[PDB]
Amino acid sequence: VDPTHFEKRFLKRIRDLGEGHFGKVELCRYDPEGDNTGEQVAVKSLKPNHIADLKKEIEILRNLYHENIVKYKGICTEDGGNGIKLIMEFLPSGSLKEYLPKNKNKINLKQQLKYAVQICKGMDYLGSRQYVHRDLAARNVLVESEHQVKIGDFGLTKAIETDKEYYTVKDDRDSPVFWYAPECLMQSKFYIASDVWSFGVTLHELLTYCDSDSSPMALFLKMIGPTHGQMTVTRLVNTLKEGKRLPCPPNCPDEVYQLMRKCWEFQPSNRTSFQNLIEGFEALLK
Amino acid sequence: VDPTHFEKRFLKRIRDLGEGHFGKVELCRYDPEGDNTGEQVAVKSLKPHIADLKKEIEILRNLYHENIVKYKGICTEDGGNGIKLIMEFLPSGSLKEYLPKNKNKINLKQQLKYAVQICKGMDYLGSRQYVHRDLAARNVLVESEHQVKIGDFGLTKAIETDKEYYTVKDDRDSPVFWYAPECLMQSKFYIASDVWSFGVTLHELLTYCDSDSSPMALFLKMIGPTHGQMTVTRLVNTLKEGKRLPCPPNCPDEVYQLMRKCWEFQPSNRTSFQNLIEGFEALLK
Numbered sequence: 001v002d003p004t005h006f007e008k009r010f011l012k013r014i015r016d017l018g019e020g021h022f023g024k025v026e027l028c029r030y031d032p033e034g035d036n037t038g039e040q041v042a043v044k045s046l047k048p049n050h051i052a053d054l055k056k057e058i059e060i061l062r063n064l065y066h067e068n069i070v071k072y073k074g075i076c077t078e079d080g081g082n083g084i085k086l087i088m089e090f091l092p093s094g095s096l097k098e099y100l101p102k103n104k105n106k107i108n109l110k111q112q113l114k115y116a117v118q119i120c121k122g123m124d125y126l127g128s129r130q131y132v133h134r135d136l137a138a139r140n141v142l143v144e145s146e147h148q149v150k151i152g153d154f155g156l157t158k159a160i161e162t163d164k165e166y167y168t169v170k171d172d173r174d175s176p177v178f179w180y181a182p183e184c185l186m187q188s189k190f191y192i193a194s195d196v197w198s199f200g201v202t203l204h205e206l207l208t209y210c211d212s213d214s215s216p217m218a219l220f221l222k223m224i225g226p227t228h229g230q231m232t233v234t235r236l237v238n239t240l241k242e243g244k245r246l247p248c249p250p251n252c253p254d255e256v257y258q259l260m261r262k263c264w265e266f267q268p269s270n271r272t273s274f275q276n277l278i279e280g281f282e283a284l285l286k
Numbered sequence: 287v288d289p290t291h292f293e294k295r296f297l298k299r300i301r302d303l304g305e306g307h308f309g310k311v312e313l314c315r316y317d318p319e320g321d322n323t324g325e326q327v328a329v330k331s332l333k334p335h336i337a338d339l340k341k342e343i344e345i346l347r348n349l350y351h352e353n354i355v356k357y358k359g360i361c362t363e364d365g366g367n368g369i370k371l372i373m374e375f376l377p378s379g380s381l382k383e384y385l386p387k388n389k390n391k392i393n394l395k396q397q398l399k400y401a402v403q404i405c406k407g408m409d410y411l412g413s414r415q416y417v418h419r420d421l422a423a424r425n426v427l428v429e430s431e432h433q434v435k436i437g438d439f440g441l442t443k444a445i446e447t448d449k450e451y452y453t454v455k456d457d458r459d460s461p462v463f464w465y466a467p468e469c470l471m472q473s474k475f476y477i478a479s480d481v482w483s484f485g486v487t488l489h490e491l492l493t494y495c496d497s498d499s500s501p502m503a504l505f506l507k508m509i510g511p512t513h514g515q516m517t518v519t520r521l522v523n524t525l526k527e528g529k530r531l532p533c534p535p536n537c538p539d540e541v542y543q544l545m546r547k548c549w550e551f552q553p554s555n556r557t558s559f560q561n562l563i564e565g566f567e568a569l570l571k
């Protein structure tokens with residue numbers, strides 16, 4: 001037997017954890033003895049050319065090993081044919097989007113900066129492996145415990161070619177535009193520095209406890225206008241070109257906001273690094 | 287096992303340190319155990335010129351001096367002409383990065399000691415028949431509070447024996463505000479040309495690398511900020527008239543007079559690195 005081989009007939013759905021246009025994550029119990037004693041797992045599946053993407057995502061995740069990256073558990077391959085499901089460890093506390101609004105009383109600035117350092121460690125590790133994540137947002141950071149977070153979704157993660165600085169994306173319709181660097185929005189180019197920009201926005205969310213009224217979308221739509229439709233991205237690009245950025249969160253020290261601003265230099269080459277962010281946060285935590 | 291051969295599979299990128307002249311420098315950890323405990327190294331490679339990089343590698347490989355950044359090795363491609371230069375990593379960085387953060391730590395005496403070290407490293411290079419062509423405070427690395435090292439050799443060129451200079455062809459990205467008149471006017475680079483650049487470097491060191499008082503900003507105040515493609519000719523003209531960068535704040539006249547000797551118009555009349563060393567040492571007694 002293979003413990004990474006999950007048979008479809010024993011993989012039983014409990015409830016939804018979250019879903020996109022073309023993908024979804026469900027809580028499942030893998031219960032081969034059939035007495036409701038099997039382990040709970042998170043299962044990512046496609047909604048009935050994304051199979052290739054999911055298989056590549058699986059091969060990425062399976063080979064990533066870091067305490068701040070969600071753990072691969074296995075796959076469920078379709079008896080029928082081509083289809084596949086990604087099986088991951090289940091973290092009950094959920095993403096920062098779910099967790100932070102509920103745990104405001106026990107999560108102070110110190111712990112927010114420690115989560116920020118953990119995200120940076122996971123991202124630095126990913127970068128060293130020549131991956132660009134392309135979807136770094138609070139909603140994709142899972143809470144392991146009060147003291148530990150994990151990057152929990154790799155659906156858009158792409159490999160940077162050796163001796164190149166960016167990946168160019170063709171399929172870009174389901175893009176988190178309000179987390180995206182100018183080069184991504186303008187030219188569909190994705191550097192490691194593009195993930196740093198995304199980290200800055202993620203840091204803003206963390207600092208605002210993922211409050212919906214203070215979310216990146218809500219704040220950018222307040223700047224540009226909420227009912228521009230298909231012109232939203234171009235107006236966003238224009239607002240970024242002018243130099244406008246998300247404002248300092250309430251109760252955020254200027255030192256922290258300056259580190260955030262260092263993620264948001266218009267030019268990718270002018271932005272800070274994940275290691276320089278860690279150093280900056282660690283200085284504030286000492 | 288060759289200790290100067292660095293396997294690409296164990297070189298992990300951390301962050302970009304800087305870039306110049308078709309080259310890129312990155313901090314990497316050489317981490318064969320896969321646990322982030324490996325030694326940190328500075329890795330120079332091209333932005334996607336290999337001949338220039340290979341020549342730089344061979345130069346640095348054969349330089350051994352306490353004030354010259356240490357060559358560690360190379361990372362080479364398999365069945366390719368690709369190559370990366372591996373050097374020691376100095377976490378404090380260049381004077382440009384370090385001095386503004388450490389003014390309280392680094393007084394005049396220490397600045398002069400750094401000046402001597404720079405001169406020693408440059409004089410060693412000169413004795414090897416090389417011209418540096420890019421001596422600026424950004425290219426001087428801080429080993430510690432007590433020690434600096436010249437940290438990049440991207441533009442370094444050999445001067446032929448029985449010749450006093452190297453004639454430069456590729457010059458579009460030259461650091462004109464550090465360049466002697468002969469380099470600006472005739473593209474001729476002497477050892478004396480490096481002495482000129484050292485004087486400008488000293489000015490930076492004495493001003494703690496403040497950008498508002500940088501060589502570029504100061505010269506632009508003299509000649510004019512918006513002369514565009516005519517900047518170098520206006521710079522040459524100003525130099526011909528005898529005008530120079532002013533005395534730094536709190537720099538005594540005797541340090542400034544040593545600096546002025548670096549800036550004699552004719553290269554054959556300038557002070558030498560050994561003469562500078564003696565002059566600085568006299569002040570340090």
Ligand SMILES: NC(=O)c1cnc2[nH]ccc2c1N[C@@H]1[C@@H]2C[C@@H]3C[C@H]1C[C@@](O)(C3)C2
Binds near residue numbers: 025042090091095
């Ligand atoms: N409690 C949970 O939600 C949860 C628990 N363990 C998990 N292991 C892998 C994913 C995952 C979870 N959810 C997913 C995660 C967070 C959020 C909602 C789901 C889809 C998303 O893209 C965005 C990634």
Ligand SMILES: NC(=O)c1cnc2[nH]ccc2c1N[C@@H]1[C@@H]2C[C@@H]3C[C@H]1C[C@@](O)(C3)C2
Binds near residue numbers: 303305311425437
């Ligand atoms: N902390 C550092 O920056 C650093 C540390 N150790 C190093 N060993 C070799 C280069 C180097 C470093 N940086 C480079 C150096 C200084 C500056 C920025 C880089 C490119 C440059 O041309 C200009 C030479």
